[PDB]
Amino acid sequence: GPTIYHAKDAVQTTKPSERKPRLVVFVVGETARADHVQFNGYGRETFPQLAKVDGLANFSQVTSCGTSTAYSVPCMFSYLGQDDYDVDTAKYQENVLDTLDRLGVGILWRDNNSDSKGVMDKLPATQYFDYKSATNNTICNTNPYNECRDVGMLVGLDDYVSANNGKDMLIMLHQMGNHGPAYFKRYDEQFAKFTPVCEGNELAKCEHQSLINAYDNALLATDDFIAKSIDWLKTHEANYDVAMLYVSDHGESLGENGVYLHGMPNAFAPKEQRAVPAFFWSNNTTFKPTASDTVLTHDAITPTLLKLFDVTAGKVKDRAAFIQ
Numbered sequence: 250g251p252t253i254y255h256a257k258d259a260v261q262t263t264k265p266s267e268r269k270p271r272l273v274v275f276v277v278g279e280t281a282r283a284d285h286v287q288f289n290g291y292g293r294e295t296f297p298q299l300a301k302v303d304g305l306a307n308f309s310q311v312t313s314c315g316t317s318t319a320y321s322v323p324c325m326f327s328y329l330g331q332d333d334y335d336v337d338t339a340k341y342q343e344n345v346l347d348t349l350d351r352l353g354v355g356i357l358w359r360d361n362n363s364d365s366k367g368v369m370d371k372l373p374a375t376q377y378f379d380y381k382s383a384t385n386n387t388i389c390n391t392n393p394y395n396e397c398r399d400v401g402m403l404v405g406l407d408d409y410v411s412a413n414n415g416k417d418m419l420i421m422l423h424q425m426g427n428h429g430p431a432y433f434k435r436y437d438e439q440f441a442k443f444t445p446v447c448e449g450n451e452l453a454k455c456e457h458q459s460l461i462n463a464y465d466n467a468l469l470a471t472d473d474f475i476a477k478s479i480d481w482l483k484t485h486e487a488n489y490d491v492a493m494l495y496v497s498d499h500g501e502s503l504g505e506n507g508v509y510l511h512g513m514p515n516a517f518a519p520k521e522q523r524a525v526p527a528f529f530w531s532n533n534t535t536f537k538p539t540a541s542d543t544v545l546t547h548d549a550i551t552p553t554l555l556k557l558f559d560v561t562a563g564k565v566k567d568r569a570a571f572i573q
């Protein structure tokens with residue numbers, strides 16, 4: 250077959266029948282910058298709800314694999330690491346979700362962003378769902394753009410847990426997040442807290458503060474979405490050990506030295522396109538976050554996902570992770 254394997258040696262060292270089963274939501278973020286999170290030194294509370302969640306760990310020194318969704322998302326789930334990663338061949342490689350699925354962890358991917366950028370392609374199509382349209386997402390009529398919202402991806406998840414009751418499960422929610430350039434469209438009116446707001450496509454012609462304000466209002470909506478994802482997990486914490494991982498795919502330039510948007514090649518790109526937020530929450534000490542200021546990259550995601558399910562694989566031994 251065409252697949253290039255990397256973890257045929259992978260084994261789950263404790264089974265869900267020998268301990269509490271585990272239920273994890275991985276929010277795959279979009280366009281959020283580390284330096285616009287107050288936990289990392291920003292001067293506005295852009296994540297006020299997460300700031301009040303007990304057990305929410307922040308990671309202040311995370312760098313993305315790349316500067317675009319197409320480059321970063323496959324690398325986030327890769328075994329190869331940023332040094333060997335090749336965007337053009339990523340789809341042929343066994344990735345961490347392929348491994349976990351083979352080992353019996355339920356894999357679900359809901360997408361309100363674009364698609365999985367090849368990550369889900371080898372797995373059954375019934376495990377991938379497009380949440381960008383109102384035919385699948387029930388929450389698209391809350392704004393004048395008729396734009397489907399990330400919180401719609403929480404609806405019906407209890408069916409998945411019930412269908413896989415007693416097993417380990419990993420649910421990816423690929424959110425619209427801070428996708429630009431129309432940051433002002435990314436949030437409903439209750440999050441229009443920082444004003445005034447850039448509403449034009451020529452971002453350089455907006456007042457800089459108005460551009461920042463639109464971007465930060467979109468972060469408030471993501472704060473809300475992540476908090477609601479934690480609320481959902483808590484409804485299952487009697488029977489499951491639950492956890493939420495959030496990592497953004499890349500950052501965004503907002504006019505520094507006249508640069509806007511993202512996508513600059515890694516060798517040239519400014520720090521704002523690479524420094525990304527990451528958060529981890531869990532309900533108890535089954536999982537323990539790594540020290541908040543540990544220097545980490547997207548290479549830490551695959552080892553984190555394996556460790557969350559007690560899976561060992563030689564390819565990622567000694568790699569740092571977001572949990573101990």
Ligand SMILES: [Br-]
Binds near residue numbers: 292293
């Ligand atoms: Br302010």
Ligand SMILES: [Zn+2]
Binds near residue numbers: 279280317318498
């Ligand atoms: Zn992106």
